[PDB]
Amino acid sequence: MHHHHHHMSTNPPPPETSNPNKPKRQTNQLQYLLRVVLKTLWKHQFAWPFQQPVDAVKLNLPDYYKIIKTPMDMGTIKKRLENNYYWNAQECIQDFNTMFTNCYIYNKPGDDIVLMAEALEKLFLQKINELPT
Ligand SMILES: COc1ccccc1/C=C/C(=O)c1ccc(O)cc1O
Ligand code: NA
Ligand code: NA
Secondary structure (H helix, E strand, O other), rough: OOOOOOOOOOOOOOOOOOOOOOOOOOOOOHHHHHHHHHHHHHHHOOOOHOOOOOOOOOOOOOHHHHHHOOOOHHHHHHHHOOOOOOOHHHHHHHHHHHHHHHHHHHHHOOHHHHHHHHHHHHHHOOOOOOOOO
């Protein structure tokens, strides 16, 4: 009897940051999303949980990827922007919204992590209120 001692929690593969077959563009709005929006959010005191895929193994959150089926994080977004992965600003904004929404789904109002996401989302909405063009 192994008692399933060898079945251990693992993280899923991270989201793709490059797809040569995906249509992509460099737009002023996407350049701004990288240079202004992401890079100021990245420097925020609360950015650190969001700077890379949730590592459910390290955090001992074995239920995270049971609950969250569309993970997203700013590290993935930053790579996508740097790799010219996106067709338009709205695709990138959708990834930000997914990142915040996942946090609110998995956690509860008043949790430290949710207060962090709320603060970043406030700054995010302030920054994207006006894009180029
Ligand atoms: C319940 O999750 C938290 C609660 C309070 C503060 C932070 C978190 C989440 C931390 C992360 O998600 C995280 C931090 C560092 C890292 O390398 C990977 C992560 O998923
Ligand atoms: Na929730
Ligand atoms: Na702006």
